[PDB]
Symmetry: C5
Subunit: 250 residues, 5 copies
C-alpha cells in the first residue's frame, strides 16, 4: 500500500523536488496575503474601507479596475525583492573560503612513513590548513581514496603517498595506480599531488628512509604553493627546478 510509494520516492528522489513546491506555493501566498490584507489598506486610505480591491476609474465607457492591478503590481514588487535577495544570500554562502583543506592518503604497505613529514611541513608553512588523513593498505587504493576526500571530504587538494615495490609485479601496479590518480584529478578538477618512492630508487634502508622523507617534504611544499602562492610558481616557470640535489636553467 504505502511502501511502494516510499521506495518510489527514494529511488527517483522525488521528495526534495516536491519540497520546492510547498515552499513555492506557501511563500507565494504568505507574501500576497500580507500585501493584500495589510500592505494595501495602508497604501490606500483614500479608498474607503479598503475598497482598493474594487477601486475603479472610468474613461468614457471604459472601466479600469486599477486597484486590483496596483495590488498585484505591488505584490510582484515585494515578491521580486524576495527572490532577488534570496538569490544574493545563496551567492555568499558559496563565496566565503573556509581555510583550504588538504587530504593525505598513504599506505600500510609502505615501508617509510612520509605522511608525518609532509603533514609537519604543511602545518609549518601554513598553520591554518585543515588536514584530513586516511590510510589504505595498498597503492591500488590511493585513487578511490583520494577521489573520495576530494568529493566527499571537501579537500581542495590531496597528497597520495606511496612506496611501490622493487618487483616488476609492483611496477605495473604503481603505473596503473598513478593512472587512476590521473582520472581522479580529471573527474574532480582538483589536484592530487602524487609522491611515489620505489624501494629500488635507494640502495639501502638508511637511504630509502632519508630519500622518501626529503621528497615528501618537497612535495608538501608544492601543495603549499599551488594552494596559496601560485604566483610564485610562475616566477619559477621554466627555471628548471627538480626533486632534491642539483636542478637546471638556460
Amino acid at each position: 500500500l504505502f511502501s511502494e510509494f516510499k521506495e518510489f520516492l527514494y529511488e527517483y528522489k522525488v521528495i526534495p523536488l516536491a519540497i520546492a513546491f510547498i515552499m513555492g506555493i506557501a511563500s507565494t501566498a504568505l507574501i500576497k496575503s500580507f500585501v493584500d490584507n495589510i500592505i494595501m489598506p495602508i497604501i490606500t486610505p483614500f479608498v474607503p474601507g479598503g475598497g482598493w480591491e474594487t477601486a475603479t476609474v472610468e474613461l468614457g465607457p471604459i472601466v479600469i479596475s486599477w486597484g486590483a492591478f496596483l495590488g498585484e503590481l505591488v505584490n510582484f514588487i515585494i515578491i521580486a525583492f524576495a527572490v532577488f535577495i534570496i538569490a544574493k544570500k545563496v551567492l555568499q554562502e558559496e563565496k566565503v573560503e573556509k581555510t583550504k583543506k588538504v587530504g593525505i592518503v598513504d599506505t600500510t604497505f609502505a615501508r617509510v612513513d612520509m605522511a608525518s613529514i609532509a603533514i609537519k611541513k604543511l602545518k609549518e608553512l601554513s598553520p591554518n590548513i585543515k588536514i584530513i588523513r586516511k590510510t589504505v593498505p595498498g597503492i591500488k587504493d590511493l585513487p578511490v581514496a583520494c577521489k573520495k576526500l576530494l568529493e566527499e571530504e571537501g579537500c581542495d587538494i590531496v597528497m597520495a603517498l606511496g612506496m611501490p615495490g622493487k618487483a616488476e609485479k609492483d611496477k605495473v601496479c604503481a603505473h596503473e595506480a598513478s593512472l587512476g590518480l590521473m582520472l581522479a584529478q580529471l573527474m574532480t578538477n582538483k589536484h592530487i599531488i602524487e609522491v611515489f618512492v620505489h624501494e629500488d630508487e635507494a640502495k639501502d634502508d638508511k637511504e630509502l628512509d632519508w630519500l622518501a622523507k626529503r621528497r615528501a617534504e618537497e612535495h608538501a611544499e608544492n601543495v603549499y604553493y599551488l594552494l596559496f602562492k601560485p604566483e610564485y610558481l610562475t616566477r619559477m616557470a621554466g627555471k628548471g627546478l627538480r626533486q632534491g640535489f642539483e636542478d637546471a636553467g638556460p
Copy 2:
C-alpha cells in the same frame, strides 16, 4: 495514440517529476483546508461564526483585514513545520548506516576457490556482515560484475578474486582487467579489493592452492579494516607491512 505518450514518459522520466506536483499541490491544500476550516475557528471564538476570514480592525480611515492574514500566517507556520520536519526525517533515514554489505566476485576459470576462505574469514571478524556472491566465467568479467554489485546491489565494498594464467596472453587480460577495476572504483567511489594470483607466482598445485588461500584471507582482513577499524590502518601507516 496513447502509447507515444507512455513511451515519451519512460524516455524522459517525466512521471516522477509530476508526482512531485500532485504531492506539492495536494499537501498544500490539505494543510490549509485544515487550518482554515478547523484551526482558525478554534483560534477565534471571539469573532462570530468563524468570521475570522472577514475579521477586521480600523485605524483611522485604514481597514486592515487581519483575520485573513492571521489565517495565512498560521497556515504558513503549520506548513513550515511540515517541511522542517519532513526534512529532518529524510536526514536520519538517509544519513544513518546499515550493516555493511560486502560483494564477492570470482571466477569459474580460476583454479583455486578463494571466495570460500575469504567469506569465512570475513564472517569470523564480523559475524554481522551481509555477503553477496556472484560469479562470472573469465577475469574479463570482474569489472562489470563488481561495478554492478556496488551500484545495483548496494555493496559497500567488493572483492574481486582472480587467477590470471601463466601465458603472456593471460597477462594482458589480467592488467586490462585490473584497470577496469580501477575505473569501476573511481566511477563508484567505493573500494574493490583486488586479489589476483597468477598461476606462475607459485611453483606447483600445492603452493598455488596454499598461496591463493593465504592472500584471500589477508585481503579479507583488509576489507574488515577499511570497513570497520580504519583507525587501525593509519596506525600501521608507513609501517612496512609487506
Copy 3:
C-alpha cells in the same frame, strides 16, 4: 519569433519538464472534481442538496466548517491511493519476463563466421531468446557497436566476435579494441562477451576455422549461463574449468 523558443526547448529539454505540470495539474483537478461533485453528495445525503461544502457544526461560539475539510480529507485520500498505486505499477517495470535479448557483433574483416555457430548454440540452449545482429567492418568497430546494442537496442548482453590479425600492427588494434569493450561494459553495467581469435593462435585455415567455431560455441554457452543459470557458475567457482 516562434523559432528561438522551439530551439530553446530542444537545447534545454524543457518540453518534457512541462508535461509533468499538465499531468500534475490536470490529474489533480479531475480527481477532486469527481470527489466534490459526485463522491461527496453520495457520502452526504444527510446534508440537504449537497450542502456538505457549507456543512457546519457549532461548539459554543466556535464554528467549524467540517464539510469542507471532510471533502478535502477524502480528496487527499483518493489522490494518495492514486499516487501510491501509480508508484506501484512503475515499480513492476521489473517484469523482465519479456525474454532476455542478446546482441551479436562481428566483422567482415574476420576470416571465419563465428556469429553463425554462436547464434545457433544460443537459440538451442534457450529457444526463447531474441537475437539482434549487427556487423561492422573492423575490430576497431566492435566497441561503439556493442555499446549501441546495449543502450539503443535493449540487449541484455552482447557478444563481440573478432579475429585480430597476425601482424604486430594488428596486435595493438586488438588490445585497444578489447579495452574499449572494457569501458563499454563499465559505462553500461552490462556484459559484453569478448571472443577474439588471433589468426596466429592456429597454424592453418582448417584449424583457424575449427578453433574459432569451438570458442564461439563455448562463449555462447556462457552468455546462456550468466544470463539464465548464474547459480551454476558459482558451483563451478574456483573449479579451474578453464
Copy 4:
C-alpha cells in the same frame, strides 16, 4: 541589486526550468477556458443558458452536480490528447532519416591528402551525403576534432585521416591518438572510422602516396556501407581485406 539574481539564474540555470511552469500553467488554462466557455454550451443545449456548470440530477437524497464533472471530464480528455499529441511530435524529430552527414578530419602534418579521395568516393556512392571537413595540425588533434563534429556538427559518422611518422616518438603518439578516438566513439555512440597510414608501411614516396589513397578509398566505402546498406556487411560477415 538586480544583478545577483541574473548571475544566480545563469549559474543554476533556473530560467529554463521556469519556462516549463508558464507553459504548463498557460496551456492548462487556455485548454479549459475553451472547453468551459465554448465547448460545453455547444455540448449542452438542453441545459438552459449554459447552466451545465450547475446542472444536477437527484438520486433519492443524493445531489450530484454532474455538469461540473462532465465539463472536467471533457476538459481532461481534451488536455490528454494535447499531451498525447505533443508527445508524438517530439518523438518525430529524431527520425531514422535526415540526409546522412559525414565528418572528415585530417592533418596538415600528414604527407598525403587522403581526404580528397575519400570525399570523392563518398560523393560517388551516394551523391546525397552532406560532408563536413575540419583539419587540425597534428594527429594528436583528431580526437577532440572528431568528437566535435559528432556532437556539435551533427555528423552521423566521422573519418579520421592520419599519417603517423616513422620515428618511435611518432608511434607512441599514433597509439595514444587512436585510443582517444576509441573513447570518442564510446562517449558519442557513433562511429569514427580510423584510417592511419604509417610512413614506414610503404617503402617510398610513390607507394606511400598510392597506398594512402587506396585505403582512404576503401574505408570511405565502409562509411557508405555502415551508413546505408548495413545488411550487406552482415552478408560479408568472410575475411574481406
Copy 5:
C-alpha cells in the same frame, strides 16, 4: 528545528529549484492581472462596465461566454510573447562571443621557459587575445591544470608546455601525462595543444634551449590558426608539415 532544513537545502540544492516556482507563479499572475483589469476593459468599451467577463452571445439555445475566453486568449497571447522574448534574450547571453581566451600551462620542473615565446608570438599574431597563465610543478600536473582553465576559466583553447626528462622514469610520466590531456580535451570538447620537448631530443643546453623555444613558437602559431583562420589549415591539409 530550522537547521536540518537549511542543511537539507544545501545538500540537495532545492533552493534554486523553488525560485523557479515563485517566478513562474508570480509572473503568471502579474501578466493576467494586467490583461484582465486593464487590457480587456480597454478592448471592450461596448460591453458595459467591464462586463466582458460575463459577456455572452446566444446561438439558439446555446450560450457562449465569449468574453471570458477572449480574455484568456488575449492573456495567453501576452504570456506567449513574454516567454518567446524571454527565451530570445537568454540566447544572446548564451551565445555572445567576446575575444577568444587562451590558457597557457607550464612547469617549474621544465628547464626552458617556452611559455614566454609562445605568449609573445600569440600576442603578436592577434593582439586582441586574452592570455591566462598557470604553472604547476610537474608534468603530471598539466591535465587537471588545463581542464581547469578550459572549464573554470573560460579558455577556448589551452597550451600545455612540458619538458619530460631523459630518464625512462620520466618517459612513463610523460606518456601518462599526455594521455591525461587526451581525456581532458574529450571531456571538454576544446583543444589543448600539447607541446612537449624531451631533454634528450637535443644534445646540449644550447640546443635544448633553442629547440624548445622554436617549437613553442610554432605551436603558438597553430593556436592562432585553429583559433582564427582555420580555413588556412585545410588549405595546408595533407601538405606535409
